[PDB]
């Protein structure tokens, strides 16, 4: 047992650097504020709540395998994949009165 | 008290009435290892030979000065700290004396002549701001033992030994005017005191003007453990005398 | 087929690192980075 799978489910609060999922193959894709690793493990780049969505898959032009698979699609198909997002909770900062000069 | 009033009416306390406090006596109830696979590292490699120094903070010294336990009108040695029980040092367990500590640098208002084995820059500054003197002196294990508890030494019958010079490692420390070494050049002290006063933003008071200057300038020369006594003397505590040899070779040995 | 060899820095001396090289290919010289002088310098092998 490799003990792979989703580590943090939907609606779960997440801190920066938390690992969301560990996968051998891209079962889930990095979405907003979710970074990937060498092991293709999805970690969180911000602090917030995890959401799982279905999004249109437009792969990178340099990815020749994904590119020609996209080409072989008819003019009826559009590829979809499951993405993982972190909706950030806290604002990135506040303005405080330091001194009255 | 009401309890003694209660005792008035109760039967006499005898050996047939006593009882332990409840909760005092539990009833007798009757009817590759982990630490091997880990690599060796030299965490405790030379621990028995490392020097240790008990910290005397300025809060503690102020507190002891403040309750009459350490007299700041006389020089403050290790003997005075041990007698005032402000510091407890064990020569076994390789203590090498007392290190002054800057804790309580603010709110230290005492004019003292202290002698400590180590002193931080801030602690020296705090003492010298109030018109005080700090010296850093050295004590070998044997002389340190004699200083901390002189009375059990005087019951041993041996003539007072001369304390040894620092080892090679500690000679640069104690020959330096920045840490007020007791083997440092007196001439460089005013420079160092002015540097500290300038750095920490206080005026350096010249000690020569206060009536305690004679006391604040009292130091014991190296190879002396106690202030008024010289090495080679024997203390006769029973009849309250000091015996000093007059032999030439002995005097040469003790004045070396 | 391959040998674990060591290269020694020409600059920032006393710094070395290990790589792998083929048994038949020529003497191995690289341009590595050393933190002794904190710069990139050449490394030339000395011992296999």
């Amino acid at each position: 047992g490799r003990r792979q799978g989703i580590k943090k489910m939907e609606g779960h609060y997440v801190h920066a650097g938390n690992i969301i999922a560990t996968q051998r193959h891209f079962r889930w894709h990095p979405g907003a504020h979710v970074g990937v690793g060498k092991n293709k493990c999805l970690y969180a780049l911000e602090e917030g709540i995890v959401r799982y969505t279905k999004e249109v898959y437009v792969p990178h032009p340099r990815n020749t395998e994904a590119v020609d698979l996209i080409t072989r699609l008819p003019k009826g198909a559009v590829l979809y994949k499951t993405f993982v997002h972190v909706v950030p909770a806290k604002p990135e900062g506040t303005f405080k009165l330091v001194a009255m000069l | 008290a009401r309890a003694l009033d209660l005792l008035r009416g109760l039967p006499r306390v005898s050996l047939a009435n006593l009882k332990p406090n409840p909760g005092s006596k539990k009833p007798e109830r009757r009817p590759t290892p982990f630490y091997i696979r880990i690599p060796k590292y030299g965490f405790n490699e030379g621990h028995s030979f490392r020097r240790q120094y008990k910290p005397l903070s300025l809060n503690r010294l102020q507190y002891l000065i403040d309750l009459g336990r350490v007299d700041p009108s006389q020089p403050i040695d290790l003997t005075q700290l041990v007698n005032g029980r402000g510091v407890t040092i064990q020569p076994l367990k390789r203590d090498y004396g007392v290190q002054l500590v800057e804790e309580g640098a603010d709110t230290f208002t005492a004019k003292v002549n202290i002698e400590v084995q180590l002193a931080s820059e801030l602690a020296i500054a705090a003492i010298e701001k109030n018109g005080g003197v700090v010296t850093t002196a050295f004590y070998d294990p044997r002389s340190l033992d004699i200083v901390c508890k002189p009375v059990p030494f005087f019951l041993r019958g041996q003539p007072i030994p001369k304390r040894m010079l620092p080892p090679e490692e500690l000679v640069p420390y104690y020959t330096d005017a920045k840490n007020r070494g007791y083997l440092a050049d007196p001439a460089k002290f005013p420079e160092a005191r002015l540097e500290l006063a300038r750095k920490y933003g206080y005026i350096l008071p010249d000690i020569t003007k206060d009536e305690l200057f004679k006391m604040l300038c009292t130091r014991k020369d190296p190879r002396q453990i106690f202030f008024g006594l010289a090495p080679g003397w024997v203390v006769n505590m029973a009849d309250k005398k000091i015996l000093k040899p007059t032999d030439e070779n002995l005097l040469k040995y003790y004045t070396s | 087929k391959n040998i674990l060899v060591r290269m020694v820095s020409e600059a920032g001396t006393g710094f070395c690192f290990n790589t792998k090289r083929n048994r038949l290919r020529e003497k191995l010289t690289l341009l590595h980075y050393d933190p002794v002088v904190k710069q990139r310098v050449l490394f030339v092998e000395k011992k296999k």
Binding site: - | F34, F43, R50, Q52, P55 | -
Partner: protein
């Protein structure tokens, strides 16, 4: 371990623990990682950084080590320039 020695009737320390571990006065035991100097040529830089690290011990490991060392090794030591002085006391712990 020896709870009662044949000459003094005293407990005895296991010197392997002393040669492998540092005990912080707070109760924490510090150890090195296995293989931090063995076969470094193939290890990835992340792994080498992980192995070149002073690491804390388990609660069970800590109590077991406390059982295999005597009180002398649990005493407060005031060394002169100890790099681990700041770690001997514990700060802001709320259990």
């Amino acid at each position: 371990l020896t709870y009662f020695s044949a000459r003094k009737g005293k407990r005895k320390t296991v010197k392997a623990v002393i040669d492998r571990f540092l005990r912080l006065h707070c109760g924490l035991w510090v150890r090195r990682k296995a293989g931090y100097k063995k076969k470094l040529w193939k290890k990835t830089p992340a792994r080498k950084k992980r192995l070149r690290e002073f690491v804390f011990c388990n609660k069970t490991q800590s109590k077991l080590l406390d059982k295999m060392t005597t009180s002398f090794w649990k005493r407060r030591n005031w060394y002169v320039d100890d790099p681990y002085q700041k770690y001997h006391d514990r700060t802001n712990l709320k259990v």
